[PDB]
Structure formats: structure tokens, C-alpha cells
Design a protein around this nucleic acid. Structure first.
Ligand SMILES: [Mg+2]
Ligand SMILES: [Mg+2]
Ligand SMILES: [Mg+2]
Ligand SMILES: [Mg+2]
Ligand SMILES: [Mg+2]
Ligand SMILES: [Mg+2]
Ligand SMILES: [Mg+2]
Ligand SMILES: [Mg+2]
Ligand SMILES: [Mg+2]
Ligand SMILES: [Mg+2]
Ligand SMILES: [Mg+2]
Ligand SMILES: [Mg+2]
Lengths: 247, 121, 67, 230
RNA sequence: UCAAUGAAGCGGAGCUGGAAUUCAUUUUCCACGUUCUAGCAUUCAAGGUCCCAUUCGGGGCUGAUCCGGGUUGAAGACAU
RNA sequence: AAAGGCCUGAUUUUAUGCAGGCCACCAUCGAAAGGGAAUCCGGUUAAGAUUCCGGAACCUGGAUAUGGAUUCUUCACGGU
């Protein structure tokens, strides 16, 4: 009878991201002539915490190639990157942690992060703390590079897409239990209004498809078709299987 | 074929001549007379007991003045209407919506003699 | 006159000549604004027989509408 | 000189911030500049039906110079001369009054699309010049066919502005000679012969050939490398 | 149709270096000033060459190859 | 999206047009507890005061000479 909780989120009123304290979007340099043909040297000036983000951010300063001034960048710091370290970003950059290289110019088994999905989009893949992409093959004709994503999927990217050598820093974070609601509160106070969560069965039928009943139960399958409409997709959407993962 | 050199990749709107208006007829053709002359600025003196004791104690003339008058205009009007030199002007808007000006004169002028010359006391 | 040839020619919308002109023009109009002044009618014979005159005070606008 | 030396700068990648360079190729032009350039481009990318692209076969420079030289001898009266001969007619009506014949017969270029088309349909025209850049092109695109049908020599010639300047207009879109004087009959005949050899005598072949389909610089390069490679 | 950029270096051809045990045959590809260091890098660039009539200064070319003005990448009669 | 204002020094029929320079920014509204130029004491009224009176300060925007500083090793000197 009433618009359900997951439906209201798309209206984007109280469910927006809490962006006040954030350092700015984490991006590689815009793909320019220098990094298309050679490389350019930057300096790691700061390693800074970013609100709502597990991984720390590297503020890297580059000289503008076309006017006398310095341009700053907000990279996601890879593990082992330190302040004062020189970053080299280009086709001719060296294979060292922190450098930014095209995918086609790194060997097999290279571990990269903040990989571009398309050349020039400035990083889309393997950005969360401890995550990385493995270069698993090259296809030099119609240059493509086969990669392994953090989720395990095999992706084919253009060999000109860029990535940063190494693993996103801050890894092992989710290894520590939060121990208490208050630490989840402060974690999501910096992210968005997704917390706490009320169970649908705990609600009334007007509020949720799981609602109602003289006992708390779901009453029909929690596995919902991919073609169900908004207001129906509460449960396990398009589930190929359920139950404890045990072959 | 020759071509011009462009250091910038940004095209800007070129600078063209902007002509001053040369109207075929005047907009109103009779200018308004001064909306705030000295007589309009200074409406009348204020003659309450407090205002008057200010007159013989602080070298101050207390005036009801126009709500459109600022301290410059009040200073200029007092100098013109009464030929006294003004040291300071304090202004307030009274709870009846009129404006009261405390106009202190220099030591070279008395406030009693001016108030007498204006007519009150 | 030429207006009789234009009137007859405009009726052959699926001939090669009008199909080419149609594709080039429809691209041009899409690039311009949804409503924009036209310097002149692209169909002078059609404009005339609707009452357009080539004189000061007659204006042509071009407008596209979502189908 | 002991006081001046050679600095030379290193305008390579990563050194010596780049000098000012001609960036006209990368200028982001106003959309109207873009639209007119890309309009010219798209009209030659697509296949052009022979009824168009029979145009842009234009009277070449030498016989265009000849044609306009003959035409400029038959310019229409301007306002000044027209009112001068109006005064001459008034003077005759005052003193002579033959019938109305102070002025003599005129020999002027005919213009105006409706006037010229009717002149062609009546077989009065002896040479027709069609502008190659009229927009919309529908106004003249039938003229070569009509002239060929009616046996009227025609030339597609560069410039509606050029036609307009010989009839005291900004743009004429068409010009025609229906008659000349004896001193120019031979020049008209020889120019008609050259113009016929260029336009009407090629009409049957030109009607069969499509224009356009031309590639851009980069596509043409990448086509001829694959023609060579494979 | 998608994306980016203050639409800055695209495409093609050169030159040079270089491996090519190249024939005087780009038929070959390659590379096209920067990697110990938390420095610095801007004044139509110094220099080379030519001119002005040069008035302390100014203008050319070069430095900084040429050509096509398609900003560049994706995608394409599919999708929308 | 063709979105534009900042100095020249000239010029001393001169107003501020007039040949070079710079600039890539792009409405506006949003806090009397956020940020923010600068004031105090004493006295005074029926009722006002960090606002009036007396004395003593400060800041900002202007103008403007004098003294001092520097200056024929021109744009200070001292201290490892
Ligand atoms: Mg409802
Ligand atoms: Mg948002
Ligand atoms: Mg719960
Ligand atoms: Mg309940
Ligand atoms: Mg229900
Ligand atoms: Mg006006
Ligand atoms: Mg007030
Ligand atoms: Mg006040
Ligand atoms: Mg405000
Ligand atoms: Mg604060
Ligand atoms: Mg006090
Ligand atoms: Mg009180």
C-alpha cells in the first residue's frame, strides 16, 4: 500500500552521500599527450585519510605541460607509496609501485589498481582497500588485455587503458570486527543513510512485501524474478541458488 | 590560401562597436525637480522637554527630518537653512515612523541663539 | 514560372534527389535549436501558396516537435 | 659577445613548458561554424544523386571570364540611367511625341527565376547561366533538364553573387541572354559552342553518374593502407 | 549513440638514431630530448640568419620538418 | 553557449577614444550562534547608551607635504 524503503532511496532526499569531508574525486590524470607518448613525473606530497573511504588518498603534484603552474591530483594510494616519492605516469613509465602505466605495456601477472575501464576514464576498477587487478593476458592485434577483476570475473580491456602498479592500500580492514552498533553508526555517518536496517518481516504489510502475519515469516519465496517491478524486488533478486555455499 | 594563427583553442565572442544611445526623443523631457531639497530634508524642529534641554546643554538641535534623508543630507540642509556649521549628526527612527536627527553644532555656534532665531523657545 | 516545377518536384519525396536533400537537411535542423529563425523559406512555392510574401514584416521560423 | 649565450630550451615531454603553437586545427569553433563545415562534409560523404552533382561541374575560369565579359556588356539600367531616360521620354512627350519612342530598344541581361524559366519554355533564351550554389537547390535543379529539353544552351557557373553583380542585385541565381547586338553575335555563338561542349553535350552521361561517396582524410588514408596491405 | 577536454600535439609523409651481415629497393620494423635526490622550470626564448631606416628599438624566418584544418577516443546502421 | 573585464603608457585639438599586455574565470540567494577591519573607561536620564558627554584610542577608504631612510660601489646594513 505504501512505497517501500528501497523504493524511496532513488528519490535521493535523505539517502544522498555525505560528501562534506571528502578530499575530492579520486582520479588518474586526464589522458594527455605526455602520458600517451612518454611519461610525466609527479611528486607524492601527502597521504591523507578520506571520509567514507577505507583506502587513503595520495595527493600527487604534476607540472602543467602547457602553462607555468602545478596541477594536483587525488590518487588512491597504493600500499608502499610514501610522501616525497616520485610517480611516473605514461606509456614509457617504469614498472614500479605507484607508477601509472598502460595495460598493454606491463607483463603477464602484473598487479595493478585503479584500472581504467576505457582509456581516459581515469580509473574504474579495483579502487577499494586491498583490491587489485591481475593482467592475465595480452592480445596484441586489435590490442586488448585480458584481466582478472577483484570479484573473479575475466574482463577484456583496451591495451591503452591505464592502471597503477600495486595494490590499493588499507587492506585487511574488514578483518577487524566492529564489535558494536556505535562503530557501524560512525562508519555510515560518513557514508550515507543506509543504517540501521529494519527487517521487512518485522514490518506491516503496508510497509513491505515481507510484512504482516501472526508470526514473523516471509510466506512466499524470497527469490524474486529479475523482471519483477519496483516495490516487488525485496529479497534475493534473480537468485540462481540459495542456501549455505557448500557444493 | 593563407590562414591566421591561433595560440588558443578557445574561440571568444569578438569585440564589436557598442554605440551610445542617440534617442530620437527624450524619455520624459522635463527633469524632475530636486526630490530632497533642504526644506524637504528638514521637516520641523522637535520641541519636547528632553530635546530642549539638549538644546541648551549639548549645543544640539533636535529636528524631525525626512525618512529619505541620510546624515549627509541632514548636515547639508542644516548648514544651508540655518547657516550654522555642523559638528556631528546622529539619527534614529522614532516608534511613530518619523526620523529624529540630533545635530550637534561646533563650539563656534550656540544652540540657544539658533533655536531662538528659528523661533522655538 | 519555377513555382510549378517546385510544387511538382516537392511531391516526389521518395525520389533519389529529395531523399538526399531530406537526409542532409534533417541533420542540419537537428543540429540547430529546437526553435530558430529561418533566413528564408526552404519551400518558397509552399510558403507563397500559404500566403508568405518576400517583404519586410514576413518572418519564417523553424521548429521541431517530438513525435 | 661575452654577455649573451645559447639557452636552448628542451621542448620534450617532461621539460620546458610548451611554447605557443598554432592550435587553429584544434579550435573549438562556434556551433554555426561547425554546422556549415559539417554540412559541406556530409553532402559529399553521402552518395549524391546525379541531378545534384551535375552541379559543381562549373564553367572553368577562362570561359567564365569570357562569359561574364560578354554579359557585362548587357547590364540592365541602374536607377540613375532609368530616370535619365525617363526624363528623355518626358522631354519627347513635351516636344516631339512620335509615339513614345524617345528611348531606343534595350539589350539587357534577363534575370529572375520565374522570368528566365518562362523565357526558356518559350525558346526565347539564347544562353542561360545557372548559379551553382543556390539554397534550396530545388529552384534550379530542374534547369539543366529544362534547357536540354528546350534546346537552350546553359552553363552551370560559379556564383549567384557573381550573377547578381551584373544585374545590380546581391544575388540573381540565374542570368540569360535572349538577344545580342551584331557586334556580339559571333562572340555569343563561339561561347555557346564551348558552353554546349561542356554542359548540354555531356548531359546524357552526367545524368547517369552519382556524386559523393568521398572519404575524409583519415578514412582515405586508412583505406589505401589496407588496399596496399591486403 | 557513449565519453572527455581551457576541444594541445590526431592522421599521413618525412628527417635522424638504431638493429637490420640490404642490393643505393622504407621492400623492414623500431625509437623519436625527461627515472639516484620532497630543488628549480613562466616574461612573443636565448642563440643563428635577414631586413627596417632602426628611435633606446621593431619586424621575418629559424630555433620548434612538411602536409590534411576530421578536437580526440569508443560505437555504428546495430543500438536509440 | 561566439557567455569577458584588468592595466597600459601613451595623448596633453582630449576626452579617456585611440596600438601592444594580461586573463579562461562564467549569475544570484543561503548564518543577527560559522568566517569576519577597527573602542575603551568615567559620568549623565523618569525612561538611552561599548551609540549621548569628557577624556583616551583604533580601523578603513582618500589625499598629501615635511622629517627620517636610501642614492656618483643606485634599489639598506648588521649577525658564523
Ligand atoms: Mg503507494
Ligand atoms: Mg549528487
Ligand atoms: Mg534488523
Ligand atoms: Mg509489528
Ligand atoms: Mg503487498
Ligand atoms: Mg535604444
Ligand atoms: Mg537608523
Ligand atoms: Mg543608528
Ligand atoms: Mg549573501
Ligand atoms: Mg568553523
Ligand atoms: Mg561609557
Ligand atoms: Mg536600560
Amino acid at each position: 500500500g505504501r512505497v517501500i524503503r528501497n523504493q524511496r532511496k532513488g528519490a535521493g532526499s535523505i539517502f544522498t552521500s555525505h560528501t562534506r569531508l571528502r578530499q575530492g574525486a579520486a582520479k588518474l590524470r586526464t589522458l594527455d599527450y605526455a602520458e600517451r607518448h612518454g611519461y610525466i613525473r609527479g611528486i607524492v606530497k601527502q597521504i591523507v585519510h578520506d571520509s567514507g573511504r577505507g583506502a587513503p588518498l595520495a595527493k600527487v603534484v604534476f607540472r602543467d605541460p602547457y602553462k607555468y603552474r602545478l596541477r594536483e591530483e587525488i590518487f588512491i594510494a597504493n600500499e608502499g607509496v610514501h610522501t616525497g616519492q616520485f610517480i611516473y605516469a605514461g606509456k614509457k613509465a617504469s614498472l614500479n609501485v605507484g607508477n601509472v602505466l598502460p595495460l598493454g605495456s606491463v607483463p603477464e601477472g602484473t598487479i595493478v589498481s585503479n584500472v581504467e575501464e576505457k582509456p581516459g576514464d581515469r580509473g574504474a576498477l579495483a579502487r577499494a582497500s586491498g583490491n587489485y587487478v591481475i593482467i592475465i593476458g595480452h592480445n596484441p592485434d586489435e590490442n586488448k588485455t585480458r584481466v582478472r577483476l577483484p570479484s573473479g570475473a575475466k574482463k577484456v580491456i583496451s591495451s591503452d587503458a591505464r592502471g597503477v602498479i600495486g595494490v590499493i592500500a588499507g587492506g585487511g580492514r574488514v578483518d577487524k570486527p566492529l564489535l558494536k552498533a556505535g562503530r557501524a553508526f560512525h562508519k555510515y555517518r560518513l557514508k550515507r543513510n543506509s543504517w540501521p536496517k529494519t527487517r521487512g518481516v518485522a514490518m506491516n504489510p503496508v510497509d513491505h512485501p515481507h510484512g504482516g502475519g501472526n508470526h514473523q515469516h516471509i510466506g512466499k519465496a524470497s527469490t524474486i524474478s529479475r523482471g519483477a517491478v519496483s516495490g516487488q524486488k525485496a529479497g534475493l533478486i534473480a537468485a540462481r541458488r540459495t542456501g549455505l555455499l557448500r557444493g | 590560401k593563407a590562414l591566421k594563427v591561433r595560440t588558443s583553442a578557445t574561440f571568444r565572442l569578438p569585440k564589436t562597436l557598442k554605440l551610445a544611445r542617440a534617442p530620437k526623443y527624450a524619455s520624459k523631457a522635463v527633469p524632475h525637480y530636486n526630490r530632497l531639497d533642504s526644506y524637504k530634508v528638514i521637516e520641523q524642529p522637535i520641541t519636547s522637554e528632553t530635546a530642549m534641554k539638549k538644546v541648551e546643554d549639548g549645543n544640539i538641535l533636535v529636528f524631525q527630518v525626512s525618512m529619505k534623508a541620510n546624515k549627509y543630507q541632514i548636515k547639508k540642509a542644516v548648514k544651508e537653512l540655518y547657516e550654522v556649521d555642523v559638528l556631528k549628526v546622529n539619527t534614529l527612527v522614532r516608534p511613530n515612523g518619523t526620523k529624529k536627527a540630533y545635530v550637534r553644532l561646533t563650539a563656534d555656534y550656540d544652540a540657544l541663539d539658533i533655536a531662538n532665531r528659528i523661533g522655538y523657545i | 514560372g519555377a513555382y510549378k516545377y517546385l510544387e511538382e518536384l516537392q511531391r516526389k519525396k521518395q525520389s533519389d534527389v529529395l531523399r538526399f536533400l531530406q537526409r542532409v537537411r534533417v541533420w542540419e535542423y537537428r543540429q540547430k535549436n529546437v526553435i530558430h529563425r529561418a533566413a528564408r523559406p526552404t519551400r518558397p512555392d509552399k510558403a507563397r501558396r500559404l500566403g508568405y510574401k518576400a517583404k519586410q514584416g514576413f518572418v519564417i521560423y523553424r521548429v521541431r516537435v517530438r513525435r | 659577445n661575452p654577455l649573451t649565450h645559447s639557452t636552448p630550451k628542451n621542448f620534450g615531454i617532461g621539460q620546458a613548458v610548451q611554447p605557443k603553437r598554432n592550435l587553429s586545427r584544434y579550435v573549438k569553433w562556434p556551433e554555426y561554424v561547425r554546422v556549415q563545415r559539417q554540412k559541406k562534409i556530409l553532402s559529399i560523404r553521402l552518395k549524391v544523386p546525379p541531378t545534384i552533382a551535375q552541379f559543381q561541374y562549373t564553367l572553368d575560369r577562362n570561359t567564365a571570364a569570357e562569359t561574364f565579359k560578354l554579359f557585362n556588356k548587357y547590364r540592365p539600367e541602374t536607377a540613375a540611367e532609368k530616370k535619365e531616360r525617363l526624363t528623355k521620354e518626358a522631354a519627347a512627350v513635351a516636344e516631339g511625341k512620335s509615339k513614345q519612342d524617345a528611348s531606343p530598344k534595350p539589350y539587357a541581361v534577363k534575370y529572375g527565376l520565374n522570368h528566365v524559366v518562362a523565357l526558356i519554355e518559350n525558346k526565347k533564351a539564347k544562353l542561360v547561366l545557372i548559379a551553382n550554389d543556390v539554397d534550396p537547390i530545388e529552384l534550379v535543379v530542374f534547369l539543366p533538364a529544362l534547357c536540354k529539353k528546350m534546346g537552350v544552351p546553359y552553363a552551370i557557373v560559379k556564383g549567384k553573387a557573381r550573377l547578381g553583380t551584373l544585374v545590380n542585385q546581391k544575388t540573381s541565381a540565374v542570368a540569360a541572354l535572349t538577344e545580342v547586338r551584331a557586334e556580339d553575335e559571333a562572340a555569343l555563338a563561339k561561347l555557346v559552342s564551348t558552353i554546349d561542349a561542356n554542359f548540354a553535350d555531356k548531359y546524357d552521361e552526367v545524368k547517369k553518374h552519382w556524386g559523393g561517396g568521398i572519404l575524409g582524410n583519415k578514412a582515405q588514408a586508412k583505406m589505401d593502407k589496407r588496399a596496399k596491405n591486403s
